[PDB]
RNA sequence: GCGCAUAAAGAUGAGACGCGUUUUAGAGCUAUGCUGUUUUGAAAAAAACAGCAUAGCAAGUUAAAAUAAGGCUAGUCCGUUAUCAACUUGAAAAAGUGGCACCGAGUCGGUGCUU
């Protein structure tokens, strides 16, 4: 933004400097009185009227120019010579406010009307196609293509006009194309391979083309002709019916808008008037109730001012325009308003080279400087240059060939572009893992095809009929496979590589591949593409030329721009034709491969003398692996790699995390952790730990569930329909590529009937169907298919603020239960959809998490794994291998979820923090009595280092739950049910088990499960647990960015603008609070009283007070200041006052609650089951014991109102609100005992750690109670803290 | 444990466009009434001179300023975000700093050695 108003600024300044001369012999004092509008002619230095200075000649351009689009026109039409002060508003104007650059190119307004356009297309496609050639039959076109909506919207209705044309038809994907959708003519014009085309993009040129050149020379014209039905489409409400009025067919259109502006205004008024004569005063006066008032003087928008008047208009017999004009949106519409966002800058342009041309037979500096100017509006710095910086930026990287400031004019001369480019993408491209100081190949390299086709096909073993082991395909083979058929064709199935190449070489009866799976991974698409574009197959077999084939895809890949492409390969002009070198140019590639040149043909094997490709090419007898190739002493690689980088360089404790890859979200919580790591060791004797158990996101899905989800579309889709049995498939089909679209995957996805009102579908009205969301957005932010639905209309769901109404559950649970069966829908999905008729949801399922903070759990999970894997084991033995003191284990989520579900130990988060320290202790004893218990599966739990241990081994059954996924679940069934007490199996029958479970072998009491539970117990109910807030300063924004006030709190907007009397900001925001002492006068007499309080340091007084402290203090109005008394105070200090009761420092006008109600482990198992929070499934016997339970101790309600009560009384001073807590309570003591249990649990919110904020209990809104004074904390008792908070320094504050 | 195909996601950094905000310029008016009033004077009365109030009206679209205060590094550059516990050194970086056998456990209390 800054920069964005600084360039613009500057380009101001350039035309004013262009004009410096003239506008001096002009007006002297213009630019100064321009500068200084914003002030008031009290404080105006030379004249407030800004062109002329005096008054009469600003009315009367006020009166002949209402807008400044009548000074346009006037300019662009009429040749005679105006004045230059308005020929430079004019100017700088069309400047301030140039338009996109979307569009490369130009528009020259050609018909500028639809109809002409859409009749010269119809006519190239007629005369194109004789097949079927189409007529537009007379519609009109310039409103079915003008039409305020979407584009797809307007397609369905324009292939909806001529009946027999499908929309991927080319007369329906031309009008597609049109329209700026994505299209394609790969069925249109019956093209081997895939080739859509869309206007948008800056490749449609290259793309052009390519497909015109595929297809012949035959269908050009068509396009253009879009080209300028697009170019005529753009300008829908600003459309001038005729281009040859003007030649500004925007500022003509403005005009209009203006003169509808007026007569709406002057209709709108005699019709008040005249029907409701006393609502006058409202709608033209009232400037905050959304009338014309708020629409022009207020700030009411153009929709709130068309939703105010629309029932006032329709409660008026006349006005039969106006309603008209609302529907149409275009009532009353001003001039600079939001739609102007796709007003491109060629208009401008256009309009600025004809005032010029009409100006410049007058005046010559301007008639010599015209270019100047098409320059300044012309010039857009290119995103591969980044900021114009001269090494004062740490974000630039621009190469300046001079050294002088960058103008427009010697752009092309100070910037090295290449250069520009080049540093701007070799910076954001990694580095090979193995070689780290080596660059990267880009991911088009015919070496690159090579090795990874080479290393697929290392594996691909063959079979044959009389063999009697299988044998990997020898060297001589793999070449065969590759120049038969990876050669030949972009990608070969398995079943292809079986039927074309076996039988017809070796002629195998039948081929067994024990390698790759249905298809092929790797393929050789690039040497496809060179074969298709050079036609010299030659060039790209030979071995000699794979230098100039790198250089050629480096090249391709690196850069874009056609000139650029063709200035790079200008050297290999000579092995191509010029058109050749056309097609070739055209052509630019995308993306880098992860391994570098050197790594593949580069670095040689001592005892071989053959590289890696040559190695995966042939290795004889056995044709090992990648990993084999690596790991292997016997080769030197693994010898060569360990060269890499250093590990241990330059990071100190900190520095290494701010080094880490991926978002500073993780680093904050990294920092933490470590931190309190370190502190852990450090306290407890200064010596490393036994063991470090951590817990990490990544578990184990099932195999139908984990492919169910990962389905490709075409595939889960057909699949789906097929196993259902409908016909939707065969009525319309449609690829990948044009259902990227969201409601037409939908519709496929709900076999083309409403999930809710089980009527058939229409592919017409696509965008018009309503997409709703399962659970409401009020709740959770969701755009996944698991929540949403393609329905009509958005009304049949039932209720807006909650999942969808029993209405349509008990009406549509037949088709969702057969959609279940035809694998369409998700197991999750289901539940959403029959979550309805098992309570709805409940005000307890806020959900206010974001996926994003769980491929962020999964991101610093995996981070701090290999960090701390590196930080504690250090030492290395005898054979060069890390000694672990401390082991790093990774406990899954669902061992200790279940821990807790299975042995009554539930836990309920929202009433304290501690259940994160019960947590830790949960994972602590479970892990450690885990590896103790059984050290031969000991080995996939730590971090880091692993042993083989196959699963495929452990549990070889008939049914074959290997493949991992089924396996490792069984496999975690079967070692988890061990640490029990009685064992159910799914397997097959039971088996008690010991009381201490100890391993024979290893001879030692691994668990007791009669005490190890009761010290769980304890912790569980142990009312001491070290729960801190980090003490920070807040940083960040000066204050909140959104007139006139005689208020001290307003900020000078400037320097020297005084708010008093230009208004300014407001609120600051408190960076830190200061503890001041002095004296301050008081009284009428003055008297210097002693005085103490919290001084608000904001953020942008921050740097100014920690330059000056006492400096500051004096010029704010101290006298004796102390200097060694100055205080900083974060956010969230924590002081302490009477019984126990902490307050926390939330500003330096406010606190916050600091104490927890430490609340026994019965009543929390009690809510949790009186309150239904999981469904508590399990065997229905002793679910139904818990619920008797729950009937039964029904005075535990009573006794929570108790420990509210005391608690609240003895820190919160809940007085009032409690009083109101308690009627309420005694209001529903009747109610049930889990919706009781339930509010019980939403007033726990009033006791939780932290700032104070509202909740409800019934109905009962019970809002927040903030501290609104600061004064008792002045005599309380800081508590200067430490990360674990067990070292407490406590100052006593009297002094 | 990588080379890989499909379908997604994130993150980064540039380049630009729509407003908006608040000021000023939109030279808005009419009548009536009020006082001070050079006022014709010795006063009265305004031309209400000055404002005030009452009503009634009328237009109303846009132009300009800046857009974190600002900074200097004067660049067409920087400045809203990571990055801050207490504490002693050390310019900073960085380092160090608070025990433990045992009994209880209300925001913890003791205890052997013993800080």
Same mark, same amino acid.
């Given at each position: 933004?800054?920069?964005?108003?600084?360039?613009?600024?500057?380009?101001?300044?350039?035309?004013?400097?262009?004009?410096?001369?003239?506008?001096?012999?002009?007006?002297?004092?213009?630019?100064?009185?321009?500068?200084?509008?914003?002030?008031?002619?009290?404080?105006?230095?030379?004249?407030?009227?800004?062109?002329?200075?005096?008054?009469?000649?600003?009315?009367?351009?006020?009166?002949?120019?209402?807008?400044?689009?009548?000074?346009?026109?006037?300019?662009?039409?009429?040749?005679?010579?105006?004045?230059?002060?308005?020929?430079?508003?004019?100017?700088?104007?069309?400047?301030?406010?140039?338009?996109?650059?979307?569009?490369?190119?130009?528009?020259?307004?050609?018909?500028?009307?639809?109809?002409?356009?859409?009749?010269?297309?119809?006519?190239?496609?007629?005369?194109?196609?004789?097949?079927?050639?189409?007529?537009?039959?007379?519609?009109?076109?310039?409103?079915?293509?003008?039409?305020?909506?979407?584009?797809?919207?307007?397609?369905?209705?324009?292939?909806?006009?001529?009946?027999?044309?499908?929309?991927?038809?080319?007369?329906?994907?031309?009008?597609?194309?049109?329209?700026?959708?994505?299209?394609?003519?790969?069925?249109?014009?019956?093209?081997?391979?895939?080739?859509?085309?869309?206007?948008?993009?800056?490749?449609?040129?290259?793309?052009?083309?390519?497909?015109?050149?595929?297809?012949?020379?035959?269908?050009?014209?068509?396009?253009?002709?879009?080209?300028?039905?697009?170019?005529?489409?753009?300008?829908?409400?600003?459309?001038?019916?005729?281009?040859?009025?003007?030649?500004?067919?925007?500022?003509?259109?403005?005009?209009?808008?203006?003169?509808?502006?007026?007569?709406?205004?002057?209709?709108?008024?005699?019709?008040?008037?005249?029907?409701?004569?006393?609502?006058?005063?409202?709608?033209?006066?009232?400037?905050?109730?959304?009338?014309?008032?708020?629409?022009?003087?207020?700030?009411?928008?153009?929709?709130?001012?068309?939703?105010?008047?629309?029932?006032?208009?329709?409660?008026?017999?006349?006005?039969?325009?106006?309603?008209?004009?609302?529907?149409?949106?275009?009532?009353?519409?001003?001039?600079?308003?939001?739609?102007?966002?796709?007003?491109?800058?060629?208009?401008?342009?256009?309009?600025?080279?004809?005032?010029?041309?009409?100006?410049?037979?007058?005046?010559?500096?301007?008639?010599?400087?015209?270019?100047?100017?098409?320059?300044?509006?012309?010039?857009?710095?290119?995103?591969?240059?980044?900021?114009?910086?001269?090494?004062?930026?740490?974000?630039?990287?621009?190469?300046?060939?001079?050294?002088?400031?960058?103008?427009?004019?010697?752009?092309?001369?100070?910037?090295?572009?290449?250069?520009?480019?080049?540093?701007?993408?070799?910076?954001?491209?990694?580095?090979?893992?193995?070689?780290?100081?080596?660059?990267?190949?880009?991911?088009?390299?015919?070496?690159?095809?090579?090795?990874?086709?080479?290393?697929?096909?290392?594996?691909?073993?063959?079979?044959?009929?009389?063999?009697?082991?299988?044998?990997?395909?020898?060297?001589?083979?793999?070449?065969?496979?590759?120049?038969?058929?990876?050669?030949?064709?972009?990608?070969?199935?398995?079943?292809?590589?079986?039927?074309?190449?076996?039988?017809?070489?070796?002629?195998?009866?039948?081929?067994?591949?024990?390698?790759?799976?249905?298809?092929?991974?790797?393929?050789?698409?690039?040497?496809?593409?060179?074969?298709?574009?050079?036609?010299?197959?030659?060039?790209?077999?030979?071995?000699?030329?794979?230098?100039?084939?790198?250089?050629?895809?480096?090249?391709?890949?690196?850069?874009?721009?056609?000139?650029?492409?063709?200035?790079?390969?200008?050297?290999?002009?000579?092995?191509?034709?010029?058109?050749?070198?056309?097609?070739?140019?055209?052509?630019?590639?995308?993306?880098?491969?992860?391994?570098?040149?050197?790594?593949?043909?580069?670095?040689?094997?001592?005892?071989?003398?053959?590289?890696?490709?040559?190695?995966?090419?042939?290795?004889?007898?056995?044709?090992?692996?990648?990993?084999?190739?690596?790991?292997?002493?016997?080769?030197?690689?693994?010898?060569?790699?360990?060269?890499?980088?250093?590990?241990?360089?330059?990071?100190?404790?900190?520095?290494?995390?701010?080094?880490?890859?991926?978002?500073?979200?993780?680093?904050?919580?990294?920092?933490?952790?470590?931190?309190?790591?370190?502190?852990?060791?450090?306290?407890?004797?200064?010596?490393?730990?036994?063991?470090?158990?951590?817990?990490?996101?990544?578990?184990?899905?099932?195999?139908?569930?984990?492919?169910?989800?990962?389905?490709?579309?075409?595939?889960?889709?057909?699949?789906?329909?097929?196993?259902?049995?409908?016909?939707?498939?065969?009525?319309?089909?449609?690829?990948?590529?044009?259902?990227?679209?969201?409601?037409?995957?939908?519709?496929?996805?709900?076999?083309?009937?409403?999930?809710?009102?089980?009527?058939?579908?229409?592919?017409?009205?696509?965008?018009?169907?309503?997409?709703?969301?399962?659970?409401?957005?009020?709740?959770?932010?969701?755009?996944?298919?698991?929540?949403?639905?393609?329905?009509?209309?958005?009304?049949?769901?039932? @209720?807006?603020?909650?999942?969808? &109404? #029993?209405? /349509?559950?008990?009406?549509? $649970?037949? *088709?969702?239960?057969?959609?279940?069966? !035809?694998?369409?829908?998700?197991?999750?999905?289901?539940?959403?959809?029959?979550?309805?008729?098992?309570?709805?949801?409940?005000?307890?399922?806020?959900?206010?998490?974001?996926?994003?903070?769980?491929?962020?759990?999964?991101?610093?999970?995996?981070?701090?794994?290999?960090?701390?894997?590196?930080?504690?084991?250090?030492?290395?033995?005898?054979?060069?291998?890390?000694?672990?003191?401390?082991?790093?284990?990774?406990?899954?989520?669902?061992?200790?979820?279940?821990?807790?579900?299975?042995?009554?130990?539930?836990?309920?988060?929202?009433?304290?923090?501690?259940?994160?320290?019960?947590?830790?202790?949960?994972?602590?004893?479970?892990?450690?009595?885990?590896?103790? @218990?059984?050290?031969?599966?000991? &080995? #996939?739990? /730590?971090?880091?280092?692993? $042993?083989? *241990?196959?699963?495929?081994?452990?549990? !070889?059954?008939?049914?074959?739950?290997?493949?991992?996924?089924?396996?490792?679940?069984?496999?975690?069934?079967?070692?988890?049910?061990?640490?029990?007490?009685?064992?159910?199996?799914?397997?097959?029958?039971?088996?008690?088990?010991?009381?201490?479970?100890?391993?024979?072998?290893?001879?030692?009491?691994?668990?007791?499960?009669?005490?190890?539970?009761?010290?769980?117990?304890?912790?569980?109910?142990?009312?001491?647990?070290?729960?801190?807030?980090?003490?920070?300063?807040?940083?960040?924004?000066?204050?909140?960015?959104?007139?006139?006030?005689?208020?001290?709190?307003?900020?000078?907007?400037?320097?020297?603008?005084?708010?008093?009397?230009?208004?300014?900001?407001?609120?600051?925001?408190?960076?830190? &609070?200061?503890? /001041?002492?002095?004296?301050?006068?008081?009284?009428?007499?003055?008297?210097?009283?002693?005085?103490?309080?919290?001084?608000?340091?904001?953020?942008?007084?921050?740097?100014?007070?920690?330059?000056?402290?006492?400096?500051?203090?004096?010029?704010?109005?101290?006298?004796?200041?102390?200097?060694?008394?100055?205080?900083?105070?974060?956010?969230?200090?924590?002081?302490?006052?009477?019984?126990?009761?902490?307050?926390?420092?939330?500003?330096?006008?406010?606190?916050?609650?600091?104490?927890?109600?430490?609340?026994?482990?019965?009543?929390?198992?009690?809510?949790?089951?009186?309150?239904?929070?999981?469904?508590?499934?399990?065997?229905?016997?002793?679910?139904?014991?818990?619920?008797?339970?729950?009937?039964?101790?029904?005075?535990?309600?009573?006794?929570?109102?108790?420990?509210?009560?005391?608690?609240?009384?003895?820190?919160?001073?809940?007085?009032?609100?409690?009083?109101?807590?308690?009627?309420?309570?005694?209001?529903?003591?009747?109610?049930?005992?889990?919706?009781?249990?339930?509010?019980?649990?939403?007033?726990?919110?009033?006791?939780?750690?932290?700032?104070?904020?509202?909740?409800?209990?019934?109905?009962?809104?019970?809002?927040?109670?903030?501290?609104?004074?600061?004064?008792?904390?002045?005599?309380?008792?800081?508590?200067?803290?430490?990360?674990?908070?067990?070292?407490?320094?406590?100052?006593?504050?009297?002094?």
């Amino acid at each position: 933004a800054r920069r964005r108003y600084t360039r613009r600024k500057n380009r101001i300044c350039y035309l004013q400097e262009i004009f410096s001369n003239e506008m001096a012999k002009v007006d002297d004092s213009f630019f100064h009185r321009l500068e200084e509008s914003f002030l008031v002619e009290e404080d105006k230095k030379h004249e407030r009227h800004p062109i002329f200075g005096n008054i009469v000649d600003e009315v009367a351009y006020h009166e002949k120019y209402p807008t400044i689009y009548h000074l346009r026109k006037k300019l662009v039409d009429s040749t005679d010579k105006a004045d230059l002060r308005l020929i430079y508003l004019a100017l700088a104007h069309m400047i301030k406010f140039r338009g996109h650059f979307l569009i490369e190119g130009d528009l020259n307004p050609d018909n500028s009307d639809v109809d002409k356009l859409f009749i010269q297309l119809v006519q190239t496609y007629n005369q194109l196609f004789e097949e079927n050639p189409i007529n537009a039959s007379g519609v009109d076109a310039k409103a079915i293509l003008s039409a305020r909506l979407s584009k797809s919207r307007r397609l369905e209705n324009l292939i909806a006009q001529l009946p027999g044309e499908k929309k991927n038809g080319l007369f329906g994907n031309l009008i597609a194309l049109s329209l700026g959708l994505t299209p394609n003519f790969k069925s249109n014009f019956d093209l081997a391979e895939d080739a859509k085309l869309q206007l948008s993009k800056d490749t449609y040129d290259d793309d052009l083309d390519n497909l015109l050149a595929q297809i012949g020379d035959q269908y050009a014209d068509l396009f253009l002709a879009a080209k300028n039905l697009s170019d005529a489409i753009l300008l829908s409400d600003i459309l001038r019916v005729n281009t040859e009025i003007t030649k500004a067919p925007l500022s003509a259109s403005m005009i209009k808008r203006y003169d509808e502006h007026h007569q709406d205004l002057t209709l709108l008024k005699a019709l008040v008037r005249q029907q409701l004569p006393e609502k006058y005063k409202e709608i033209f006066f009232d400037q905050s109730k959304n009338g014309y008032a708020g629409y022009i003087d207020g700030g009411a928008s153009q929709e709130e001012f068309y939703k105010f008047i629309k029932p006032i208009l329709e409660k008026m017999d006349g006005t039969e325009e106006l309603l008209v004009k609302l529907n149409r949106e275009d009532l009353l519409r001003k001039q600079r308003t939001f739609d102007n966002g796709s007003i491109p800058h060629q208009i401008h342009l256009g309009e600025l080279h004809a005032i010029l041309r009409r100006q410049e037979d007058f005046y010559p500096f301007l008639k010599d400087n015209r270019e100047k100017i098409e320059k300044i509006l012309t010039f857009r710095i290119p995103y591969y240059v980044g900021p114009l910086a001269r090494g004062n930026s740490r974000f630039a990287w621009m190469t300046r060939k001079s050294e002088e400031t960058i103008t427009p004019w010697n752009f092309e001369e100070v910037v090295d572009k290449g250069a520009s480019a080049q540093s701007f993408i070799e910076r954001m491209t990694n580095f090979d893992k193995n070689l780290p100081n080596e660059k990267v190949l880009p991911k088009h390299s015919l070496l690159y095809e090579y090795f990874t086709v080479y290393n697929e096909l290392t594996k691909v073993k063959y079979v044959t009929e009389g063999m009697r082991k299988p044998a990997f395909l020898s060297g001589e083979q793999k070449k065969a496979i590759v120049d038969l058929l990876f050669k030949t064709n972009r990608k070969v199935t398995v079943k292809q590589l079986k039927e074309d190449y076996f039988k017809k070489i070796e002629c195998f009866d039948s081929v067994e591949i024990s390698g790759v799976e249905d298809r092929f991974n790797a393929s050789l698409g690039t040497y496809h593409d060179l074969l298709k574009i050079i036609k010299d197959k030659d060039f790209l077999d030979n071995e000699e030329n794979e230098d100039i084939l790198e250089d050629i895809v480096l090249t391709l890949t690196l850069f874009e721009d056609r000139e650029m492409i063709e200035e790079r390969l200008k050297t290999y002009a000579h092995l191509f034709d010029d058109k050749v070198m056309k097609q070739l140019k055209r052509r630019r590639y995308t993306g880098w491969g992860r391994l570098s040149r050197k790594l593949i043909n580069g670095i040689r094997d001592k005892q071989s003398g053959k590289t890696i490709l040559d190695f995966l090419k042939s290795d004889g007898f056995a044709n090992r692996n990648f990993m084999q190739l690596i790991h292997d002493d016997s080769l030197t690689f693994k010898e060569d790699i360990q060269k890499a980088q250093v590990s241990g360089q330059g990071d100190s404790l900190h520095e290494h995390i701010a080094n880490l890859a991926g978002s500073p979200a993780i680093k904050k919580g990294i920092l933490q952790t470590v931190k309190v790591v370190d502190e852990l060791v450090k306290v407890m004797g200064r010596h490393k730990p036994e063991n470090i158990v951590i817990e990490m996101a990544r578990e184990n899905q099932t195999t139908q569930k984990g492919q169910k989800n990962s389905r490709e579309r075409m595939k889960r889709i057909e699949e789906g329909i097929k196993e259902l049995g409908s016909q939707i498939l065969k009525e319309h089909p449609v690829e990948n590529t044009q259902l990227q679209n969201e409601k037409l995957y939908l519709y496929y996805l709900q076999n083309g009937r409403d999930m809710y009102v089980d009527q058939e579908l229409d592919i017409n009205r696509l965008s018009d169907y309503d997409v709703d969301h399962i659970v409401p957005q009020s709740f959770l932010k969701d755009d996944s298919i698991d929540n949403k639905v393609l329905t009509r209309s958005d009304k049949n769901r039932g @209720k807006s603020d909650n999942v969808p &109404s #029993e209405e /349509v559950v008990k009406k549509m $649970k037949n *088709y969702w239960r057969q959609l279940l069966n !035809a694998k369409l829908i998700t197991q999750r999905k289901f539940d959403n959809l029959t979550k309805a008729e098992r309570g709805g949801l409940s005000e307890l399922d806020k959900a206010g998490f974001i996926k994003r903070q769980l491929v962020e759990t999964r991101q610093i999970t995996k981070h701090v794994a290999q960090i701390l894997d590196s930080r504690m084991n250090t030492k290395y033995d005898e054979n060069d291998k890390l000694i672990r003191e401390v082991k790093v284990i990774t406990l899954k989520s669902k061992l200790v979820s279940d821990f807790r579900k299975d042995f009554q130990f539930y836990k309920v988060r929202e009433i304290n923090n501690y259940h994160h320290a019960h947590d830790a202790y949960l994972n602590a004893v479970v892990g450690t009595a885990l590896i103790k @218990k059984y050290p031969k599966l000991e &080995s #996939e739990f /730590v971090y880091g280092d692993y $042993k083989v *241990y196959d699963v495929r081994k452990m549990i !070889a059954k008939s049914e074959q739950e290997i493949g991992k996924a089924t396996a490792k679940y069984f496999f975690y069934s079967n070692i988890m049910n061990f640490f029990k007490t009685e064992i159910t199996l799914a397997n097959g029958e039971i088996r008690k088990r010991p009381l201490i479970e100890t391993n024979g072998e290893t001879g030692e009491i691994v668990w007791d499960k009669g005490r190890d539970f009761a010290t769980v117990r304890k912790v569980l109910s142990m009312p001491q647990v070290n729960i801190v807030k980090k003490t920070e300063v807040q940083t960040g924004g000066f204050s909140k960015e959104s007139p006139k006030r005689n208020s001290d709190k307003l900020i000078a907007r400037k320097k020297d603008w005084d708010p008093k009397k230009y208004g300014g900001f407001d609120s600051p925001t408190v960076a830190y &609070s200061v503890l /001041v002492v002095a004296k301050v006068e008081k009284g009428k007499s003055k008297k210097l009283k002693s005085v103490k309080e919290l001084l608000g340091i904001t953020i942008m007084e921050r740097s100014s007070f920690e330059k000056n402290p006492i400096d500051f203090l004096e010029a704010k109005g101290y006298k004796e200041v102390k200097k060694d008394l100055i205080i900083k105070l974060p956010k969230y200090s924590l002081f302490e006052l009477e019984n126990g009761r902490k307050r926390m420092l939330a500003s330096a006008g406010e606190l916050q609650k600091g104490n927890e109600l430490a609340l026994p482990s019965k009543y929390v198992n009690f809510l949790y089951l009186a309150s239904h929070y999981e469904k508590l499934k399990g065997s229905p016997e002793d679910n139904e014991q818990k619920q008797l339970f729950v009937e039964q101790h029904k005075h535990y309600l009573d006794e929570i109102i108790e420990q509210i009560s005391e608690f609240s009384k003895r820190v919160i001073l809940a007085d009032a609100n409690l009083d109101k807590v308690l009627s309420a309570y005694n209001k529903h003591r009747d109610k049930p005992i889990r919706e009781q249990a339930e509010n019980i649990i939403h007033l726990f919110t009033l006791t939780n750690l932290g700032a104070p904020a509202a909740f409800k209990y019934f109905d009962t809104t019970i809002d927040r109670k903030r501290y609104t004074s600061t004064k008792e904390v002045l005599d309380a008792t800081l508590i200067h803290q430490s990360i674990t908070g067990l070292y407490e320094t406590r100052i006593d504050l009297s002094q």
